[PDB]
Amino acid sequence: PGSARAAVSELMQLFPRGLFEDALPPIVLRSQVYSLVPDRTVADRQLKELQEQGEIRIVQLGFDLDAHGIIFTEDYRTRVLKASDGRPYAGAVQKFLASVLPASGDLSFQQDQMTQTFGFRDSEITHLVNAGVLTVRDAGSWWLAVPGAGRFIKYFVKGRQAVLSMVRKAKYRELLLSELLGRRAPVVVRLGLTYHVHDLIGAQLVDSISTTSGTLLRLPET
């Protein structure tokens, strides 16, 4: 009833665009959606509906317990076109965005489909790899990829570890949500405390316990 769409918009607002100088489309992770939409089946169904209505792209990122990213297709398009301006791979990127991206919601593309169905030459596929738009998936396919995602991946994993440590260091390896969110962020946490808390909850790296003091984040040792 708009649940996943509302969750995506709440999480998108947390993304610090300026951290990457606006070079990356804002990214939210599937497990963050589960923090706000705890019925995973409802969340997945509504995300699939958004994918089939053409509004979001699902991207393989590969974090333990939070494998997929979610991006608005128009944010991906406008900025990939922007990251490609005046570069050698601009033509190949434009062809990919105009013809391949609209043709499905898939996370990956087969080599034979790219060459035979869409008419890409090997050199043009190499341009897409150099642009950061494709990465190798297996011997016959490529993942859709986000130019500049490597920096996001490194900041994200370090921040996940640091926020989890804030919980681990607390008494009995548990910390109230209001307490955590009011702490100074460890310097390595670049994407923000709240952004990270939603990943920890949705991935089940912390349990979200309802108490008469509000939400308690508990490391799930048992």
Number of domains: 3
> Main β-sheet, in a few words?
3 strands, antiparallel
CATH topology title of the largest domain:
Arc Repressor Mutant, subunit A
Strand order of the largest sheet: 1-3-2
| The CATH C-level class name of the largest domain | Mainly Alpha
Output the radius of gyration.
19 Å
PDB class: dna binding protein
Keywords: Winged helix domain protein, DNA binding, DNA repair, DNA binding protein
Assembly: monomeric
Entry title: Monomeric Human STK19
Task: Write up this protein.
By secondary structure, the chain is an alpha+beta fold. The chain has 3 domains: 3-73, Orthogonal Bundle (Arc Repressor Mutant, subunit A), CATH 1.10.10; 84-144; 150-218. Helices cover 48% and strands 19% of the residues. It contains 10 helices and 9 strands. The protein has helices at 3-14, 30-36, 40-52, 73-83, 90-100, 111-117, 122-131, 149-169, 177-181, 193-202; strands spanning 28-29, 56-63, 66-72, 108-110, 134-138, 141-144, 174-176, 207-211, 214-218. A 3-stranded antiparallel β-sheet has the order 1-3-2, sandwiched between helices. Strands 4-6-5 form a 3-stranded antiparallel β-sheet. It has a 3-stranded antiparallel β-sheet with strand order 7-9-8. α5 packs across α7 (122-131) and α8 packs across α10 (193-202). It is elongated, with a radius of gyration of 19 Å. The two termini are 35 Å apart. Belongs to the STK19 family. One of its GO terms (molecular function) is ATP binding. Pfam families: Stk19. InterPro entries: STK19-like. This is Winged helix repair factor 1. It is classed as dna binding protein.
